[PDB]
Design a protein around this ligand. Structure first.
Ligand SMILES: Cc1cc2nc3c(=O)[nH]c(=O)nc-3n(C[C@H](O)[C@H](O)[C@H](O)COP(=O)(O)O)c2cc1C
Ligand SMILES: Cc1cc2nc3c(=O)[nH]c(=O)nc-3n(C[C@H](O)[C@H](O)[C@H](O)COP(=O)(O)O)c2cc1C
Ligand SMILES: O=c1ccc2ccc(O)cc2o1
Ligand SMILES: O=c1ccc2ccc(O)cc2o1
Ligand SMILES: O=c1ccc2ccc(O)cc2o1
Ligand SMILES: O=c1ccc2ccc(O)cc2o1
Lengths: 359, 359
């Protein structure tokens, strides 16, 4: 099975091509993770996936999506990850982390607590920042504050510090969150970036925050560990061919700047779109990026059945298959997949105290 | 659905009728549990089952099955359970524990490390104890040492101390392991008990160790928390009707002695048997015990599909359905079952960070 072939990137070898993508849990308190996360993550690692990427972890308090988001904006926050990292490694999975800044989509309620921008008089909320003072709209009506150059320098440094902390906590894989309408994506998109300085207008200027952040992170992140990013390569906003062309150009600049793998996603930059959700719908888009930027890729949003995952790999659309919601339903999804695909000794996807009995 | 109706026994209410029976993990070191157990158990609790019974936990070092078995023979061993108990409760499951003594089946290898009695010159092994100096045979050839009266008094006290420790660690449900050919079962069975003192010969004498241990435990275990036992009610050894009759009589004496629920199992006392393994095969036996001893029951060994579990409850064969191996395969089996049985808001079997996304 292609799904169960190992994958080596830099000095890291994943035992199979199943990646668990970042999935916010909304269970942290002032950014500090706890036993929710410990058990959740260690349990997923034991389920057999080759790579487990920890949820969007904010580089700064105001860059959380919600009051429940994880953070890594101080050394104490970073140290809270150490036992989790160690548990993931003990289970034979590779520990990764997505470092993030929610930009104009920050200061929101948890998804089961309204999913909308927090009210102005709620003591939990905070001012959001973005490239331009323009609201997302819909359920996220807050107008963010337009960043100064000093704010840009500060946020870049926060990404550097977060990467250094992730390194020192023992993570073996990092993902910069430049997708999903959050800060990085919003610098790239003309919908959200109306700046007239060096950080807006032209393709080079809109790319600048992302490329400078990647370069700054690269200074502290080890050369021998995968340096990756998530990026929304189209919006489904009626501008897809032009947007894809630019996104692929940016992916070439990421590759030239040391990016080892790109997690290909959708922008979610604005609400007025028509995303064609369906099984493996991102496969052709991911394949195009892979081919035209000559960069390894992963993607998600509908690959969570064993045959879809296998087919995407065999067609060289993806290098890793990210499987999200199926792992919330069943932490041992990799074992399920091994069985489905007829892998020999499928139960030994799991550790001995499970595998022995499930042969 | 019957499977998702709550159950109240003494002061404890289970959110549904799914019980996770004790399942040895073979991951402890000198009886001390660790992060293997913490994550395993907390993950199962979050999966939705109403009751989670911790694996056979030895009351004394020599009562472990293997060098990997959990123990509770000192206060330090007990204190290791405290954070696990707290995690199980945080997830809304009821924490139980099975306290045990392996008798002649002790000093064995882990099941994936030979499953047989440990060699005499292996520094890990130890002398086994039993009612009589008679080996199990087959892969367990060691002849145990015949217990003295003082040994009987000491082991009973070890069960008392274990129960007191379980209570003080915060467990809300206890199960005495009088099944599976281990020490208690072996006192009951004429195959293994050839004693000619007060603890062998007649039905009363063979029952005595079990009834005295139950009574001693009852002195320290709170009246308001379920006091349960597991007991093999037949062997499939050609003596089933006579054995079942005696087992049911003993179950009546357990009930009279304060037992709140009986986990009905098979004896496994000797190897030369013909157990008719199959789906729900224990249902009729459990039902007979339930009816003739007028005692709530659970059972296992083939109820691990949602329809089998539901059918057993609706037929009043069982009060709780114990589902073991299916939970090793999928820690979220209760969610799977809720979906299968068409329970409303089935995803909310799981906590919000999963449930919200799986609606
Ligand atoms: C609970 C939940 C939380 C998520 N949090 C993040 C996140 O932290 N960062 C991110 O880039 N994507 C996040 N996503 C998107 C997932 O990584 C993934 O792309 C999505 O679940 C689609 O894949 P699937 O169809 O296999 O579920 C999240 C999705 C879910 C369901
Ligand atoms: C891994 C494993 C370990 C077990 N350990 C114990 C134990 O500690 N005590 C016990 O009474 N039964 C033990 N059993 C028996 C289970 O509780 C249960 O009866 C058995 O798994 C049958 O139920 P199932 O068909 O749902 O798996 C164990 C079974 C398994 C698979
Ligand atoms: O998969 C594993 C195997 C062993 C193991 C052992 C200890 C522990 O804390 C975690 C573990 O994860
Ligand atoms: O579908 C989701 C749910 C939460 C979520 C949170 C962050 C993100 O980047 C993407 C997300 O997608
Ligand atoms: O099911 C739960 C819900 C919340 C929760 C919160 C913290 C924790 O440590 C464990 C938990 O288990
Ligand atoms: O099937 C099993 C495997 C291990 C095991 C261990 C203890 C016990 O009481 C019963 C058991 O049944």
């Amino acid at each position: 099975s292609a799904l169960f072939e190992p994958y080596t990137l830099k000095d890291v070898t994943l035992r199979n091509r199943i990646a668990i993508p970042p999935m916010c849990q909304y269970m942290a308190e002032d950014g500090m993770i706890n036993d929710w996360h410990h058990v959740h993550l260690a349990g997923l690692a034991r389920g057999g996936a080759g790579l487990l990427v920890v949820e969007a972890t904010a580089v700064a308090p105001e860059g959380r999506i919600t009051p429940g988001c994880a953070g890594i904006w101080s050394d104490a926050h970073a140290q809270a990850f150490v036992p989790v990292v160690q548990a993931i490694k003990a289970a034979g999975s590779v520990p990764g982390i997505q470092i993030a800044h929610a930009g104009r989509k920050a200061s929101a309620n948890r998804p089961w607590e309204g999913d909308d921008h927090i009210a102005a008089d709620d003591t939990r909320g905070w001012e959001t920042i973005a490239p331009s003072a323009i609201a997302f709209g819909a359920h996220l009506p807050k107008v963010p504050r337009e960043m100064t150059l000093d704010d840009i320098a500060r946020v870049k440094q926060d990404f550097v510090d977060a990467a250094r902390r992730a390194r020192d906590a023992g993570f073996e894989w990092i993902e910069l969150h430049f997708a999903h309408g959050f800060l990085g994506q919003s610098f790239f998109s003309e919908h959200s970036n109306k700046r007239t300085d060096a950080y807006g207008g032209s393709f080079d200027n809109r790319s600048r925050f992302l490329l400078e952040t990647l370069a700054a992170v690269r200074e502290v992140w080890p050369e021998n560990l995968p340096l990756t990013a998530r990026f929304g390569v189209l919006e489904y906003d009626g501008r897809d061919e032009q947007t894809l062309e630019e996104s692929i150009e940016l992916a070439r600049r990421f590759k030239a700047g040391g990016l080892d793998l790109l997690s290909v996603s959708v922008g979610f930059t604005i609400p007025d779109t028509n995303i064609p959700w369906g099984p493996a719908f991102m496969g052709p888009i991911a394949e195009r990026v892979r081919r035209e930027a000559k960069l390894p890729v992963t993607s998600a949003w509908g690959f969570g059945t064993p045959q879809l995952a296998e087919a995407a790999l065999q067609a060289n659309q993806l290098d890793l298959v990210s499987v999200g919601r199926a792992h919330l339903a069943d932490p041992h999804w990799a074992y399920f997949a091994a069985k489905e695909l007829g892998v020999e000794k499928a139960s030994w996807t799991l550790p001995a105290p499970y595998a022995h009995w499930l042969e």
